[PDB]
Design an enzyme around this catalytic site. Structure first.
Site, PDB file in Angstrom:
ATOM      1  N   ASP A 125       0.841  -1.188   0.000  1.00  0.00           N
ATOM      2  CA  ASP A 125       0.000   0.000   0.000  1.00  0.00           C
ATOM      3  C   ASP A 125       0.880   1.243   0.000  1.00  0.00           C
ATOM      4  O   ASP A 125       1.980   1.239   0.548  1.00  0.00           O
ATOM      5  CB  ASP A 125      -0.923  -0.011   1.222  1.00  0.00           C
ATOM      6  CG  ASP A 125      -1.819   1.211   1.300  1.00  0.00           C
ATOM      7  OD1 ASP A 125      -2.311   1.661   0.249  1.00  0.00           O
ATOM      8  OD2 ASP A 125      -2.062   1.714   2.417  1.00  0.00           O
ATOM      9  N   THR A 135       0.271   4.995   0.774  1.00  0.00           N
ATOM     10  CA  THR A 135       0.313   6.012   1.821  1.00  0.00           C
ATOM     11  C   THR A 135       0.328   5.350   3.189  1.00  0.00           C
ATOM     12  O   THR A 135      -0.601   4.617   3.542  1.00  0.00           O
ATOM     13  CB  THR A 135      -0.875   6.961   1.715  1.00  0.00           C
ATOM     14  OG1 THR A 135      -1.005   7.423   0.367  1.00  0.00           O
ATOM     15  CG2 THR A 135      -0.665   8.151   2.620  1.00  0.00           C
ATOM     16  N   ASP A 183      -1.075  -0.281   6.345  1.00  0.00           N
ATOM     17  CA  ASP A 183      -1.220   0.340   7.657  1.00  0.00           C
ATOM     18  C   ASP A 183      -2.674   0.391   8.120  1.00  0.00           C
ATOM     19  O   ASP A 183      -3.019  -0.177   9.161  1.00  0.00           O
ATOM     20  CB  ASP A 183      -0.618   1.745   7.634  1.00  0.00           C
ATOM     21  CG  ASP A 183      -1.177   2.601   6.513  1.00  0.00           C
ATOM     22  OD1 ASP A 183      -1.599   2.035   5.486  1.00  0.00           O
ATOM     23  OD2 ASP A 183      -1.200   3.839   6.659  1.00  0.00           O
ATOM     24  N   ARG A 229       0.726  16.248  -4.172  1.00  0.00           N
ATOM     25  CA  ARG A 229      -0.606  15.733  -3.872  1.00  0.00           C
ATOM     26  C   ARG A 229      -1.512  16.902  -3.524  1.00  0.00           C
ATOM     27  O   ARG A 229      -1.441  17.423  -2.409  1.00  0.00           O
ATOM     28  CB  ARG A 229      -0.545  14.737  -2.715  1.00  0.00           C
ATOM     29  CG  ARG A 229      -1.869  14.117  -2.345  1.00  0.00           C
ATOM     30  CD  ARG A 229      -1.693  13.133  -1.207  1.00  0.00           C
ATOM     31  NE  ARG A 229      -1.551  13.817   0.072  1.00  0.00           N
ATOM     32  CZ  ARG A 229      -2.481  13.820   1.018  1.00  0.00           C
ATOM     33  NH1 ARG A 229      -3.616  13.164   0.831  1.00  0.00           N
ATOM     34  NH2 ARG A 229      -2.275  14.470   2.153  1.00  0.00           N
ATOM     35  N   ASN A 259      -8.119   0.611   5.089  1.00  0.00           N
ATOM     36  CA  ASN A 259      -8.469   0.417   3.687  1.00  0.00           C
ATOM     37  C   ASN A 259      -8.256  -1.028   3.268  1.00  0.00           C
ATOM     38  O   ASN A 259      -8.956  -1.535   2.387  1.00  0.00           O
ATOM     39  CB  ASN A 259      -7.643   1.347   2.803  1.00  0.00           C
ATOM     40  CG  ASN A 259      -8.127   2.774   2.847  1.00  0.00           C
ATOM     41  OD1 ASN A 259      -7.816   3.519   3.775  1.00  0.00           O
ATOM     42  ND2 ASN A 259      -8.887   3.172   1.835  1.00  0.00           N
ATOM     43  N   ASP A 260      -7.304  -1.711   3.895  1.00  0.00           N
ATOM     44  CA  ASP A 260      -6.823  -2.992   3.399  1.00  0.00           C
ATOM     45  C   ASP A 260      -6.803  -4.073   4.472  1.00  0.00           C
ATOM     46  O   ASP A 260      -5.932  -4.940   4.454  1.00  0.00           O
ATOM     47  CB  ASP A 260      -5.430  -2.820   2.807  1.00  0.00           C
ATOM     48  CG  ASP A 260      -4.568  -1.922   3.649  1.00  0.00           C
ATOM     49  OD1 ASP A 260      -5.045  -1.502   4.719  1.00  0.00           O
ATOM     50  OD2 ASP A 260      -3.424  -1.635   3.247  1.00  0.00           O
ATOM     51  N   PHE A 274     -16.175  13.510   7.005  1.00  0.00           N
ATOM     52  CA  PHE A 274     -15.496  13.209   5.752  1.00  0.00           C
ATOM     53  C   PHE A 274     -15.721  11.747   5.398  1.00  0.00           C
ATOM     54  O   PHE A 274     -15.420  10.858   6.199  1.00  0.00           O
ATOM     55  CB  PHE A 274     -14.000  13.503   5.853  1.00  0.00           C
ATOM     56  CG  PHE A 274     -13.210  13.047   4.659  1.00  0.00           C
ATOM     57  CD1 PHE A 274     -13.254  13.755   3.471  1.00  0.00           C
ATOM     58  CD2 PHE A 274     -12.417  11.913   4.731  1.00  0.00           C
ATOM     59  CE1 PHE A 274     -12.524  13.336   2.373  1.00  0.00           C
ATOM     60  CE2 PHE A 274     -11.687  11.489   3.635  1.00  0.00           C
ATOM     61  CZ  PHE A 274     -11.739  12.202   2.455  1.00  0.00           C
TER      62      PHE A 274
HETATM   63  F1  ALF Z   1      -3.233   5.238   0.580  1.00  0.00           F
HETATM   64 AL1  ALF Z   1      -3.855   3.575   0.701  1.00  0.00          AL
HETATM   65  F2  ALF Z   1      -4.516   1.927   0.810  1.00  0.00           F
HETATM   66  F3  ALF Z   1      -4.325   3.639  -1.014  1.00  0.00           F
HETATM   67  F4  ALF Z   1      -3.356   3.493   2.409  1.00  0.00           F
HETATM   68 MG   LIG Z   2      -2.570   3.055   4.039  1.00  0.00          MG
END
Ligand code: ALF
Ligand SMILES: [Mg+2]
Length: 1091
Positions: free
Chosen positions: A474, A476, A796, A621, A799-800, A569
């Site tokens: 991942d 970020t 981290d 960004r 998201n995952d 958000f």
């Molecule tokens: F920024 Al990401 F999963 F896309 F932590």
């Molecule tokens: Mg992340």
């Protein structure tokens, strides 16, 4: 009859114990004992021996299996009022079968029959006649009317105490003796004590004594290593603390153990080293929790009440209604009391009202802890490979024992005392510590890992980490640091003669600085701290605002600003808006991704399309800032109706210092590393190109235009090349696209290509996925598993988490500071870093920030595999050599002494001590170790080395029989007396076992060379020096003290040359087999090429 209904169980039958007379090991054996007593009133003692042995074996057999136990001891019944046990057949994926005890107790005049399996309660529901676990109300869909109306437990509640039980983890640590009693009955320890009994029957006293001492020591060490893990699992449970609980219409302070579902509590700021008691739900108030444990993330969320939602209509969703749930095991940073009055009084402390929903092991963290402790899977689940490996050696054992028996019958030996020698050989071939090898290797690897703060939860994933084909990252938070510099505002120049013309600070129009101050999610705690997104803190400090205790953020030298009401958000329509007010009037701010903000405001600058693309292509960004003047509580789609532009927010997120080296090592070590991110494709491609995941040009799959007609386009970061593609008809051209461009896929193009015939041909040649939603990472990892590749993912945040749980081995990088760990350890010492602090987001959990955790885990798994391989080979060869030497010596009369055997045992234990120690190389290698016991390498090496050793042994035995002849006598007795054969065979055995130790050691590509580590080098040289001084008669007193007959001067030459040539032959053979068949070929994905 009697059943159990639960997802864990499969079937169950009731039981009832049998009296001692009816058991299978008492009654059927009396006729045999009587027959022996009658026939007795030489050759008959072996009959009594095997009779007692079979009796003890039948007596012990119930302890090895459970079905045998339920068939021997208990008789199945179908009346639930008489049974005193019940055998639970587990489902194929939850733990193992077991027998549990039914208990009875009367309450309020009606008894309630229950038991408890895997710390998961059951009860007896009479109307259904089936044992059924407790089902909480929040599980099935409730209307939030009953949740709002609940007013605490009243009256006597013993039935609820029995139904749901106390709220606490129940992990009991058994006394040392109560656990050694369970280890002393295992088949392996019983077999080893059987062998020691045999060696005693053979008049070996000191040898058997030493061996028994070693057995007991090893078992005690294993029990301590098994008890420390239980002592480590217990730290996850908190210590009880007092919170006010609403019962009987008044506040009485109960502890945390005494909580039930649908009980009103009042939560406050969480204490130090504590957490939230159990899975609560806000009923009134507000809190700011830090969901570190479940989500593996640091940013504090903001939880809100449930009072505002309509009562009768809506349903408790745990979807949109997720801002009210408070899990168990997370810290609560700040809580605010309720605002207005209610039907129930306010709590005495400053806490907010909340409703319990789940207590005990059935909470979110509790269920994971239970599955972790009780239903865990052990390493090497199959075990049939190890059993067949042992059976092969036993085939060799029988092949030798037949010759021993034939020659013993020939030489007039007594058969009554020859059967015991046959048994000694057959039992000496078998190595006992073979199946428990990978477990000890994995434990040592886990310790060496935990030295790097990489704590592991499920340890059977370590052998998976050795042979890994794909590694997913991942962006970020994993490959990019949290701290981000602030370059400046851009696009505020209405004229905008230059595209890349930035305004740093203290030069923008006042509207822009007001917008950048009003639209943030920070909050200043009462004690004095700033908690929120680190990016917002960096932006807000760089501009010069300051947040105060109340919502006002002011003292920037330009005015006073206060935030009236803000909106959350959300990932969908990602943007954040808030309403503020200045000394003059009222306005609003909004800050979100620039794409969505574009289609919102009316005034569109002529170069808005160009500017954020020119700034996003190269690293940065961006975000958008827009405002609107608002004249004097309403919906969201009104404040975000029409806006006015005020500039951009341009950040440069720099890489971690350890990212490039880790990715370089993984690329050079026959691993393929891909990226799976959520940012827009251009930033993803730039970071991937800077780290080293893509080399050449790159193409991107996206929608062609605004029309959602499902038509893709192969575009490039520069718009020079544009190749159209259509999902319905077109098929990918291999040499036109994949052989040149190293393409990258978007989430939308991945969604539109579902069902294509070439989806699995595209998922091999792409390395960067951008703009994927949390649900598509699970799909990508499931497909990469389905293709046959083992995977790895290190991410981290939340998201995952699904991807982390789907991958073969998952890592969660908890971003932390080394000095923070130093301060924590210093405070703990004044008052190591136990597992308790690690989260439950993934199997593995790196407590530090740097990315080297992936490399470290891979290295340790690789070393565990290779250590297991070498131990297999060494054990098998030593056993076979010892057995054939015993056979050669037992064919005739002579046998080893006592001191000779004990000295051999000690001299080989000296090498066993050192060999376990080894140090892994810093750099990973291209050659990865293969898994399995049956393959060409192990079997070929073992068989050929053993052929060499047997050739040597046959040669020297022929020589010995040539020097002094033995003749067949009548009525022999295998007695020890100093002779030439005993000396020759003893020296050869002792030298060849050392030779296998030195030859089958694992060399350079995986660990440090034999010459490097001294604890083994010097041990081997010492033992070799002793053996060679014995063989050459360098010291006559040494030979005389151990009763070695003087050897003729011609015999020493043959013996020494024979051993010294045996070592070289063995070394050459093993080196050949290793160089040819050692490492399996890497997959078809981890090759490096581009044109
Ligand atoms: F920024 Al990401 F999963 F896309 F932590
Ligand atoms: Mg992340």
């Amino acid at each position: 009859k009697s059943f159990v209904s639960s997802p864990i169980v499969r079937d169950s039958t009731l039981l009832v114990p049998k009296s001692l007379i009816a058991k299978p090991y008492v009654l059927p054996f009396f006729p045999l004992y009587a027959t022996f007593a009658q026939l007795y009133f030489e050759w008959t003692f072996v009959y009594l021996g095997t009779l007692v042995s079979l009796n003890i074996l039948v007596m012990l057999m119930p302890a090895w299996n459970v079905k045998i136990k339920a068939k021997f001891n208990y008789s199945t019944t179908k009346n639930v009022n008489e049974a005193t046990h019940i055998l639970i057949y587990t489902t194929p994926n939850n733990g193992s079968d077991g027998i549990v005890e039914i208990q009875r107790v009367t309450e309020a005049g009606s008894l309630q029959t229950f038991f408890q399996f895997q710390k998961k309660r059951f009860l007896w529901h009479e109307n259904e006649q089936v044992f059924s676990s407790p089902k909480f109300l929040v599980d099935e869909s409730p209307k939030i009317g009953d949740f709002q109306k609940c007013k605490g437990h009243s009256g006597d509640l013993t039935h609820l105490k029995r139904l749901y039980g106390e709220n606490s983890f129940d992990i009991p640590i058994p006394t040392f003796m109560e656990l050694f009693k369970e280890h002393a009955v295992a088949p392996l320890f019983v077999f080893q004590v059987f062998c020691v009994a045999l060696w005693l029957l053979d008049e070996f006293w000191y040898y058997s004594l030493f061996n028994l001492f070693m057995i007991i020591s090893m078992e005690a060490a294993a029990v301590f290593q098994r008890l420390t893990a239980l002592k480590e699992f217990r730290t996850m449970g908190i210590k009880p603390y007092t919170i006010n609980v609403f019962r009987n219409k008044k506040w009485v302070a109960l502890q945390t153990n005494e909580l039930l579902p649908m009980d009103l509590v009042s939560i406050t700021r969480t204490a130090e080293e504590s957490a939230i008691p159990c899975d609560l739900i806000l009923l009134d108030g507000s809190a700011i929790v830090n969901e570190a444990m479940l989500s593996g993330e640091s940013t504090p969320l903001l939880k809100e009440s449930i009072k505002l939602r309509p009562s009768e209509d809506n349903l408790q969703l745990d979807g949109v209604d997720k801002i009210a749930v408070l899990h168990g095991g997370t810290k609560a940073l700040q809580v605010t009391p309720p605002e207005h009055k209610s039907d129930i009084p306010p709590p005495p402390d400053g806490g907010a009202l909340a409703i319990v929903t789940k207590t005990g092991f059935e909470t979110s963290q509790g269920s994971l802890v239970r599955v972790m402790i009780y239903s865990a899977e052990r390493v090497s689940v199959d075990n049939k490979e190890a059993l067949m490996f042992i059976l092969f050696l036993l085939i060799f054992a029988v092949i030798a024992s037949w010759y021993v028996w034939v020659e013993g019958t020939k030489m007039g030996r007594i058969q009554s005392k020859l059967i015991l020698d046959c048994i000694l050989i057959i039992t000496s071939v078998v190595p006992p510590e073979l199946p428990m090898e990978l477990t000890m290797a994995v434990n040592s690897s886990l310790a060496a890992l935990a030295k790097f703060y990489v704590y592991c939860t499920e340890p059977f994933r370590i052998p998976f980490a050795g042979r890994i084909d794909v590694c997913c990252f991942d962006k970020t938070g994993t490959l990019t640091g949290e701290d981000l510099v602030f370059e400046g505002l851009a696009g505020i120049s209405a004229d905008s003669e230059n595209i890349r013309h930035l305004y740093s600070a203290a030069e923008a129009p006042e509207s822009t600085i007001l917008v950048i101050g009003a639209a943030h999610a920070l909050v200043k705690l009462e004690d004095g701290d700033i908690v929120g997104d680190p990016m917002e803190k960096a932006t807000l400090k760089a501009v010069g605002w300051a947040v105060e205790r109340k919502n006002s953020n002011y003292r920037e030298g330009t005015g006073k600003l206060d935030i009236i009401r803000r909106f959350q958000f959300s990932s969908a329509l990602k943007r954040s808006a808030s309403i503020a007010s200045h000394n003059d009037a009222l306005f609003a701010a909004v800050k979100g991704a620039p794409e969505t903000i574009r289609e919102r405001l009316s005034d569109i600058p002529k170069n808005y399309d160009e500017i954020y693309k020119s700034f996003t292509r190269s690293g940065s960004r961006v975000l958008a800032l827009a405002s609107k003047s608002l004249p004097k509580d309403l919906n969201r789609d009104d404040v975000e109706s029409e806006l006015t532009f005020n500039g951009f927010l341009i950040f440069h997120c720099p890489l971690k210092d350890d990212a490039i080296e880790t990715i370089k090592m993984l690329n050079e070590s026959s691993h393929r590393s891909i990226m799976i991110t959520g940012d827009n494709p251009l930033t993803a491609v730039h970071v991937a190109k800077e780290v080293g995941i893509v080399f050449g040009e790159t193409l991107i799959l996206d929608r062609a235009g605004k029309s959602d007609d499902n038509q893709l386009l192969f575009r490039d970061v520069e718009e020079t090349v544009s190749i159209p593609f259509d999902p319905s008809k077109d098929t990918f051209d291999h040499s036109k696209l994949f052989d040149r461009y190293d393409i990258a896929v978007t989430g939308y193009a991945l969604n539109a290509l579902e069902g294509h015939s070439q989806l699995r041909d595209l998922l091999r040649h792409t390395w960067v996925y951008a703009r994927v939603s949390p649900s598509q990472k699970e799909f990508l990892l499931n497909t990469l598993k389905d293709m046959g590749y083992q995977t790895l993912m290190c991410g981290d945040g939340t998201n995952d988490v699904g991807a982390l749980k789907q991958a073969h081995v998952g890592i969660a990088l908890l971003n932390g500071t080394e000095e923070g760990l130093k301060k924590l350890g210093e405070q703990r010492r004044l008052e190591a870093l136990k597992l308790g602090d690690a989260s439950c987001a993934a199997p593995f959990t790196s407590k530090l920030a740097n990315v080297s955790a992936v490399t470290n885990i891979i290295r340790q798994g690789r070393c565990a595999l290779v250590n297991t391989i070498q131990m297999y080979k060494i054990l098998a060869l030593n056993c076979l050599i010892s057995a054939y030497s015993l056979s050669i010596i037992y064919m005739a009369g002579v046998k080893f002494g006592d001191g000779q055997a004990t000295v051999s045992g000690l001299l080989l234990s000296v090498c066993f001590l050192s060999i376990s120690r080894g140090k892994p190389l810093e750099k990973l290698s291209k050659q990865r170790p293969q898994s399995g016991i049956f393959n060409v390498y192990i079997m070929g090496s073992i068989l050929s080395q053993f052929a060499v050793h047997i050739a040597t042994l046959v040669y020297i035995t022929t020589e010995i029989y040539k020097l002094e002849p033995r003749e067949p006598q009548v009525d022999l007795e295998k007695e020890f007396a100093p002779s030439l054969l005993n000396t020759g065979i003893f020296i050869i055995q002792l030298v060849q076992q050392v030779s296998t130790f030195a030859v089958n050691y694992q060399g350079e590509p995986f660990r440090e060379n034999i010459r490097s580590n001294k604890g083994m080098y010097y041990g081997l040289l010492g033992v070799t020096g002793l053996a060679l001084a014995s063989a050459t008669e360098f010291l006559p007193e040494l030979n005389e003290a151990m009763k070695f007959v003087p050897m003729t001067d011609d015999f020493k030459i043959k013996l020494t040359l024979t051993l010294l040539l045996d070592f070289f032959g063995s070394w050459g053979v093993e080196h050949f087999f290793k160089f040819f068949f050692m490492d399996d070929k890497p997959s078809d994905i981890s090759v490096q090429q581009v044109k």
